């Protein structure tokens, strides 16, 4: 069981440890984010129990790391002296000091191939194919890849990440095989981070620590696509035999 989401598109930003103006993202997706996306695809309002999404497994193969960019983001500026974002007491600020400036970072031009393995994976897949809310990647303004769900049904999808999945073009030496690609499994762990989601309600966001271990694996060089227009093509023909 399981399916292979294809995390790609113009921009991605999985945030963490940022409860102020300055927002930051991780160099790889976080289960809280994509579990929020499945939850958004199944129609569970914030505050509902998320126990159903427990018992899931997410190994993610990073195709390209992508470069980090900072997004400057001012909110409430230029508006007249009687329209901004109120204060808790209700007394607005002076228009010269009214707007609030947040500089939210984001990860750009990267593509990940996650491998979901869970008991509810089939309904999750069928929910992503038709959701009850626009599914996004990190934040609402980021639009996901069209091929959000690369392969809908595969037994042992991890083996599919280790072999027979298209990769974007990169420098490959002559008649060289064994090109390394990093994938994260969850001793010899890399880091601990607040990912497991316990509650999404806006009144009390509650998360917990989760282990992460990045293993650099080797893949045969027969997956690297060509210079341009070849990668998207090869992945289309790859998603073509999904019916078969």
């Amino acid at each position: 069981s399981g399916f292979l989401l294809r995390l790609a598109g113009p921009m991605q930003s999985w945030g963490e440890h940022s409860m102020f103006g300055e927002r930051d993202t991780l160099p790889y997706p976080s289960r809280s984010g994509l579990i929020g996306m499945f939850a958004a695809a199944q129609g569970v309002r914030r505050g509902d129990p998320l126990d159903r999404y427990k018992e899931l497994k997410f190994t993610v193969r990073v195709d390209r790391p992508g470069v980090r960019l900072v997004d400057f983001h001012t909110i409430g500026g230029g508006l007249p002296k009687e329209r901004t974002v109120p204060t808790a007491a209700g007394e607005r600020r002076d228009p010269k000091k009214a707007t609030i400036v947040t500089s939210r970072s984001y990860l750009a031009d990267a593509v990940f191939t996650v491998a979901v393995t869970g008991p509810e994976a089939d309904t999750i897949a069928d929910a992503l194919a038709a959701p009850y809310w626009q599914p996004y990647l990190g934040r609402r303004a980021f639009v996901p890849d069209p091929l959000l769900v690369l392969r809908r049904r595969v037994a042992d999808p991890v083996r599919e990440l280790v072999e027979a999945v298209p990769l974007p073009h990169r420098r490959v030496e002559e008649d060289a095989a064994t090109v390394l690609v990093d994938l994260i499994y969850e001793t010899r762990t890399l880091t601990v981070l607040n990912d497991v989601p316990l509650s999404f309600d806006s009144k009390s966001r509650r998360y917990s620590t989760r282990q992460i271990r990045v293993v650099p694996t080797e893949v045969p060089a027969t997956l690297v696509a060509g210079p341009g227009r070849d990668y998207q093509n090869k992945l289309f023909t790859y998603v073509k035999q999904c019916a078969e």
Binding site: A8, G9, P10, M11, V67, L69, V70, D71, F72, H73, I75, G76, L79, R83, T84, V85, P86, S103, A108, D109, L128, A129, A130, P131, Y132, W133, Q134, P135, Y136, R140, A141, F142, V143, P144, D145, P146, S202, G228, R229, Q232, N233, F236, V239, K240
Partner: protein
């Protein structure tokens, strides 16, 4: 139940929304730099235009006081003194279900028209729309209101070809000359960039109409939304670089399963020395063709174009104009 909208719009030499240091915001997609306009920009620019019309279509046309016909008139509460409130419901704009309260909690009391202060109960216009709160998320000057979202997913607009910023050396000249001329006002450098932006947005009427009701009011909100999405252009440095334009290609599609963007079609940047509108049009077509023949679905597609050279097959049936396309698509949406 997802109204997706794509549009190719070429903006001339200007600077729509600058960065933290003057440069225009840029993403690096498919390996190459690409100037972009933030989603917020093209949002506050559409919204600020929607209310300007929807919230004005119209105090002199449809009106809010023009009620009673279903709570104050065909109810018994002074069928002639109907102005009972009316005039008592004044001392933003709602739809109809939340208006039942407008003519509802507007009765009883006494009244005191014999010559009018209970508003903590009607004021909840936004708490339950204010359709401009179901289309787009909460307001920007009111505390949250049970419905923080949403619905109208809006995507960032990046160029379809690598564009590098270009430095515009400029200078200010003082008009009072001393005996040492050429002492201009202040030398400086302002960065600008031009290019053909790709834009995209989604409207989820499915989980939308609920929050409201009258499918006709919802229909009006989405139709004016699409017209504002094509019509509007941000208000950044326009008074110094007039960059008002219309999209050279408009593609509205109504999908009954899930919204889909065509951004990856523009992954491999386009090299030039020629124009970019025709190449972008036929390339978006090609991507729509392979994606359509790989993920087959019974959806509706329509598009308008300001160039009669090519024939875009995968984009549906070529309508004649933007408002005709919008009308036939909003109608075809239900």
């Amino acid at each position: 139940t997802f109204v997706d909208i794509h549009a190719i719009q070429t903006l001339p030499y200007s600077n729509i929304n600058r960065d933290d240091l003057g440069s225009p915001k840029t993403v690096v997609y498919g390996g190459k730099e690409r100037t972009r306009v933030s989603s917020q920009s093209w949002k506050r620019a559409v919204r600020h235009e929607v209310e300007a019309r929807l919230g004005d279509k119209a105090v002199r046309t449809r009106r809010i006081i023009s009620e009673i016909a279903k709570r104050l008139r065909e109810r018994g509460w002074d069928a002639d003194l109907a102005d009972a409130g009316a005039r008592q419901v004044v001392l933003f704009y709602l739809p109809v279900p939340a208006i039942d309260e407008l003519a509802a909690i507007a009765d009883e009391h006494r009244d005191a028209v014999a010559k009018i202060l209970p508003a903590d109960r009607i004021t909840e216009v936004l708490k339950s729309r204010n359709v401009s709160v179901n289309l787009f998320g909460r307001m920007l000057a009111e505390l949250p209101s049970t419905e923080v979202d949403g619905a109208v997913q809006f995507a960032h607009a990046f160029t379809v070809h690598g564009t590098t910023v270009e430095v515009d050396f400029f200078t200010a000249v003082d008009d009072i000359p001393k005996e040492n001329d050429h002492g201009s006002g202040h030398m400086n450098a302002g960065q600008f960039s031009a290019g053909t932006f790709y834009r995209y947005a989604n409207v989820n009427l499915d989980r939308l109409v609920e929050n409201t009701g009258d499918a006709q009011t919802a229909r009006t909100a989405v139709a004016e939304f699409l017209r504002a999405f094509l019509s509007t252009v941000p208000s950044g440095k326009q008074n110094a670089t007039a960059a008002m334009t219309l999209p050279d290609l408009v593609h509205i599609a109504v999908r009954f399963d899930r919204p889909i963007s065509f951004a990856p079609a523009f992954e491999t940047a386009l090299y030039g020395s020629d124009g970019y509108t025709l190449r972008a049009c036929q390339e978006l077509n090609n991507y729509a063709e392979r994606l359509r023949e790989v993920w087959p679905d019974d959806a509706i597609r329509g598009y308008a174009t300001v160039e009669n050279k090519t024939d875009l097959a995968a984009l549906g049936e070529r309508y004649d104009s933007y408002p005709a396309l919008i009308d036939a698509m909003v109608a075809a949406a239900f």
